[PDB]
C-alpha cells in the first residue's frame, strides 16, 4: 500500500467486504485494504475489532498503538509474513559511526544556526554573531560541543542572564513540555519508519530511550523557545495553551509552507533513507 | 556522675525571692553551674559525694522549694539540646559548624 | 499475573478502575489486571479498546490475537518494557560469538538431554542411548547436525517411522501450536529482558524475529511432545485443551517446583545474565 | 569525624573527657572529638592546649592555622599516623617511573576530562571539547604541555581572555584558597596513607612537600572552579563562604553519592593501592 492511515479522533473500525470501515461521529469513511500501508492509532479512545486485526495480519500492514501521551507503546507482531520494517531495522543496526557523526554534526549545526537566526530576528547582533561563530566553529566527534555555547548564550539572551535550565521555574517546565510534544511527534515519525528509537545518533549517552528522536527533534527546538519567550510572563497553564497551538500553526519548510506533521515526516524519512544509503542528502530545516 | 538539677519555687513574696537568691548562691558555692533559668548541673566525683550532695540539697532546700535531680552520663550531657524561642548545635548533625561569622 | 484468560466468545472488553471489564449480553464479569498474566483472544468477534491495550502494555501483559481457525495470528509487542532495554542493546551488540555459540551449544545439549530423559521415562533404552550418544557428540558450530538428527529420531521413534515433521497431520499442527504458544511466552520474556529478539545465538545468517526466543525455548519442547504423544489419539480440540492445561500444571525446577511461567522468566533471566557476564552459570532444566 | 569546625572568634580550647571544650566569656560549648573531622582556626586570638593537640594527633584530625588575613598559614602534620607508614616508605622508594608517569598521566586525563565535562555542562565548544581534544592528545612525559594549555584555555574561556592566573584579583585569590584547602585535605589523606608527601609522581626534579597531594588533587579543581565562576560577582567573603559550603554539599562518585571527604579518602586509598600493586585499577572521578 501507499497511504498511511492515522486516527487522531474517537472512532470505531470494522472490516466488511475487503473494505475497512472507519466510523467517526462526524462522518463515515470506507477505505480499500490494498490502498492502506501503515496504520497508527494516536489516542486511547479508538475502538477496533479482532477481525480487522486478522485482515491486517493477512494484509501485512503495521499496526501502531499509542498511549494518552501519544508516545508509541506497542506494535502488532505477526508470526508469519512479517513487515519490511523489521527487515529495515537490521540496516539501523548496521549504521556506520561516520554517517552517525555526520548526521549528528549536521543536526547540531542546524539547531545552532536556528538559534543564532532567531536571535537575529530578536535583534541581538552580538549574541547571534557569537552563536553563529560557534556554528562555524563546530567540528566532528564533538571536539567542540558548542550546542551548549549556543544554549547558554541563547537562554541568557532570551530569558535574561539570571535564567538557567537547571533552575525550577515555569519557563523550564514549559521548555520540557514543548520538548515533550516535539519528542512525541518525532518519536511517532521514527516509529513509523520502524527504526528502534533506543539506538541514538549521539554515541556518548545511551541513557535516554528516545535518543534517536531526541536527536532528530533538535533543529526544531528553538521554535518552542520563541513562543516560550513571548509568553514567559504568563502562567504555566497559559504557556501550555500557547504551546498547544503549534500543531494548528503552519511553518515554512524549505520547499513550501507546510504543517509541522508533514515537515517532521519528510525530515524523518530523509534522515532514515540517508542513514541507510550512507549520506545521500541531509535534510536541512531553517526557521 | 553528671548531676542535673532543676529548681522552682513561688517567687511572689519578698521572703521567697530572698530564699531563692540564697539557694542559688548556695548552689554556685557548691560547684553547680547555671546553664539557664532553673537549669543547673554539677559533676560529682563518685556515688558517696553524690549521696552527701543529695543530703545537703535536701537540707538547704527553701520552703516551697522544689528540686529535680537526675543522673546523666557525659555522652547524654553532650547530647543536651537547649532551644530558645534557636536550638543547641550539639544535637544538630550538621557537617560544617561555624563559631564565628556564619556568613 | 498468575492467570491465563482465554476469550473464545463474542463480547466487548473495556478498562475501568484498574479492572478488566468483560461486557456481554448474557453476563458481565470484572477481572483484576494484577492477577492476569496472559490474555488470549481465540475468536475474531471480540472487541477491545485502545485504552485497555495501553493499560495492558503498562501492565506488561502478553496479548495474543488468533484467527477464525483459532490458531494464533499476531501478538502485541511493546516498544519499551523497561528502561534497561536501551542499555542492554549496547551489550547485545557487544556480545561475542564464543559466548553465543557456547550458550547455544549448552542449550542444545540441555534439549537433547531432555529428549533422552523423555525416552528414558518412556523406557526406550536404544533410542535414549542413541540420543544420549548424540548429546555426548554435540560440538561447536554443529558440523554433524546431531540436533536435527536427534529431532528426526525423536519424532520418528515416538510417532512411527512413517511420521515426519513436514506432514500436515494434526500431530504436527498441535506441535506447531504448542511451539507458537511457548514461542509467544518466551518472546514476551525476551521483550521483558529488553534485548533484541531478532538476533539469534546460533546462526547469524538466519534472520528471524523469533530466532532468539526459539533458541531459549528449545529445551522445553519435550514437555509439549509428551502431552502430544498421550493425546495423539484424541481430537485436535481436546489436544488443544490438554495443551492449555500445561499452564495450570507445575514442573520441578532444579531449585524447587514452580509454574511454567516462573521457570521461563527465571530461566530467561539467568540466560541474559549469563550472556552479559560471559557464561557465569548456565541454567539447566530437566523433566 | 564528619564535622568541620571553624573558629573565627577569640576563645580558649581545652580537652576534657574525650570532649573538645570551647570556653569563652559569653558561652561555653563542648563538641565530641569522634564527630569532628577537620579543625580550622581562622584567627590569631584563639588559644589552645598542647594536650588537646596531642589528642587531635591521636584522633587524626587535621588542624589548620590561618593568619590575621584569615588565609591559612600552617597545618599540623603528624609524624606517625599508622604503623603501616614505615612499611610503605620502602614501597615508595621501590616505585617505578612507569607506574608514576602512568598513574599521573591517567590522573591528568581525568582532570582534563573533568574540565571538558564542566564546560560541557557549562556548555562551550572550543573551551570544552578543545579541552577534550587536548585530552585525547595527552601523552607520557607531557611534551606538548596539553595540561597547561587546557588550564590556560579553561580559565581564559571562563573568566575572559583578559583574565590570567598570575593576576592578583580576588578570583585567583579564591582559587588559591580553595586549592590550599583541598591541598590540605588531600595532604592529610596522604599522611593517613603514610607515604612521603614530598615525592611527586610527575617530575622528580621539582621538590615540594605538596607535590604529591597536588597531583592527587588535580581532578577536583573544577569543582572549585564552578563555585568560583558562579560567585565571582560576589564579595570575597561570600565566595569564601560558598567555598566552605563544599564540605556540606555531596558529590556523586561512580559507586554512589558520597561526601567530599569520603571521596578523597577512598580515592587516595585506591591511588596508593594502585601504586603499590602497579596499576591494578585507576579510580575515576566525574562531575
Curated annotation (Swiss-Prot), chains A, C, D:
A molecular function annotated in GO for this UniProt entry is: DNA endonuclease activity
Cofactor(s) essential for the protein: Mg(2+); Mn(2+)
Annotated knockout phenotype: Plasmid transformation is still inhibited.
The EC number(s) attached to this protein equal 3.1.-.-
Q: Which family does it belong to?
A: Belongs to the CRISPR-associated endonuclease Cas1 family.
* Function summary: CRISPR (clustered regularly interspaced short palindromic repeat), is an adaptive immune system that provides protection against mobile genetic elements (viruses, transposable elements and conjugative plasmids). CRISPR clusters contain spacers, sequences complementary to antecedent mobile elements, and target invading nucleic acids. CRISPR clusters are transcribed and processed into CRISPR RNA (crRNA). Acts as a dsDNA endonuclease. Involved in the integration of spacer DNA into the CRISPR cassette.
| Name of the protein this chain belongs to | CRISPR-associated endonuclease Cas1
Q: Tell me what organism the protein belongs to.
A: Streptococcus thermophilus
Encoding gene, per UniProt annotation: cas1
Curated annotation (Swiss-Prot), chain B:
* Self-association state and partner proteins as the record states: Homodimer, forms a heterotetramer with a Cas1 homodimer.
Species of origin: Streptococcus thermophilus
**Taxonomically, which superkingdom?**
Bacteria
Keyword list (alphabetical) reads: Antiviral defense, Endonuclease, Hydrolase, Magnesium, Metal-binding, Nuclease
Q: Name one Pfam family in it.
A: CRISPR_Cas2
Keyword hit for Magnesium: yes
What is the recorded name of this protein? CRISPR-associated endoribonuclease Cas2
Q: What happens when the gene is disrupted?
A: Plasmid transformation is still inhibited.
- What family, per the record? Belongs to the CRISPR-associated endoribonuclease Cas2 protein family.
Q: What is its EC number?
A: 3.1.-.-
Q: Name one GO biological process term.
A: maintenance of CRISPR repeat elements
- Co-factor(s): Mg(2+)
Which terms does the record give in the GO molecular function aspect?
Answer: metal ion binding; RNA endonuclease activity
Residue positions annotated to bind Mg(2+) are 8
The entry's function note states: CRISPR (clustered regularly interspaced short palindromic repeat), is an adaptive immune system that provides protection against mobile genetic elements (viruses, transposable elements and conjugative plasmids). CRISPR clusters contain spacers, sequences complementary to antecedent mobile elements, and target invading nucleic acids. CRISPR clusters are transcribed and processed into CRISPR RNA (crRNA). Functions as a ssRNA-specific endoribonuclease. Involved in the integration of spacer DNA into the CRISPR cassette. When the CRISPR3/cas system consisting of cas9-cas1-cas2-csn2-CRISPR3 or just cas9-CRISPR3 is expressed in E.coli it prevents plasmids homologous to spacers 1 or 2 from transforming.
Amino acid at each position: 500500500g501507499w497511504r498511511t492511515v492515522v486516527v487522531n479522533i474517537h472512532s470505531k473500525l470494522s472490516y466488511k467486504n475487503n473494505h475497512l470501515i472507519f466510523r467517526n461521529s462526524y462522518k463515515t469513511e470506507m477505505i480499500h485494504l490494498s490502498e492502506i500501508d501503515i496504520l497508527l492509532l494516536e489516542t486511547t479512545d479508538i475502538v477496533l475489532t479482532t477481525m480487522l486485526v486478522k485482515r491486517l495480519v493477512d494484509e501485512n500492514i503495521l499496526v501502531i498503538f499509542c498511549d494518552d501521551k501519544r508516545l508509541p507503546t506497542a506494535f502488532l507482531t505477526p508470526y508469519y509474513a512479517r513487515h519490511d520494517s523489521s527487515l529495515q531495522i537490521a540496516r539501523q543496526i548496521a549504521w556506520k559511526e561516520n554517517v552517525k557523526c555526520e548526521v549528528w554534526t549536521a543536526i547540531i549545526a542546524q539547531k545552532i544556526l536556528n538559534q543564532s537566526y532567531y536571535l537575529g530576528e530578536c535583534s541581538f547582533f552580538e549574541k547571534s554573531q557569537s552563536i553563529m561563530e560557534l556554528y562555524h566553529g563546530l567540528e566532528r566527534f564533538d571536539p567542540s560541543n558548542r550546542e551548549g555555547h549556543s544554549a547558554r548564550i541563547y537562554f541568557n539572551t532570551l530569558f535574561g542572564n539570571d535564567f538557567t535550565r537547571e533552575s525550577d521555574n515555569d519557563i523550564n517546565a514549559a521548555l520540557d513540555y514543548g520538548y515533550t510534544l516535539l519528542l512525541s511527534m518525532f518519536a511517532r515519525e521514527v516509529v513509523v519508519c520502524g527504526c528502534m528509537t533506543q539506538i541514538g545518533l549521539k554515541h556518548a549517552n545511551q541513557f535516554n530511550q528516545f535518543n534517536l528522536a531526541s536527536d532528530i527533534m533538535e533543529p526544531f527546538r528553538p521554535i518552542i523557545d520563541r513562543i516560550v519567550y513571548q509568553n514567559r510572563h504568563n502562567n504555566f497553564v497559559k504557556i501550555k495553551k500557547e504551546l498547544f497551538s503549534i500543531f494548528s500553526e503552519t511553518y515554512l519548510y524549505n520547499g513550501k509552507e507546510m504543517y509541522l506533521s508533514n515537515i517532521v515526516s519528510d525530515y524523518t524519512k530523509k534522515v532514515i533513507k540517508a542513514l541507510n544509503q550512507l549520506g545521500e542528502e541531509i535534510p536541512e530545516f531553517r526557521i | 556522675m553528671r548531676m542535673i538539677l532543676m529548681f522552682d519555687m513561688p517567687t511572689d513574696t519578698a521572703e521567697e525571692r530572698k530564699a531563692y537568691r540564697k539557694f542559688r548562691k548556695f548552689l554556685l558555692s557548691e560547684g553547680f553551674i547555671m546553664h539557664q533559668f532553673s537549669v543547673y548541673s554539677k559533676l560529682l566525683l563518685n556515688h558517696t559525694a553524690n549521696t552527701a550532695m543529695v543530703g545537703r540539697l535536701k537540707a538547704n532546700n527553701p520552703k516551697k522549694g522544689n528540686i529535680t535531680i537526675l543522673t546523666v552520663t557525659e555522652k547524654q550531657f553532650a547530647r543536651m539540646i537547649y532551644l530558645y524561642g534557636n536550638t543547641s548545635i550539639a544535637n544538630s548533625e550538621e557537617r560544617l559548624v561555624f563559631l564565628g561569622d556564619n556568613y
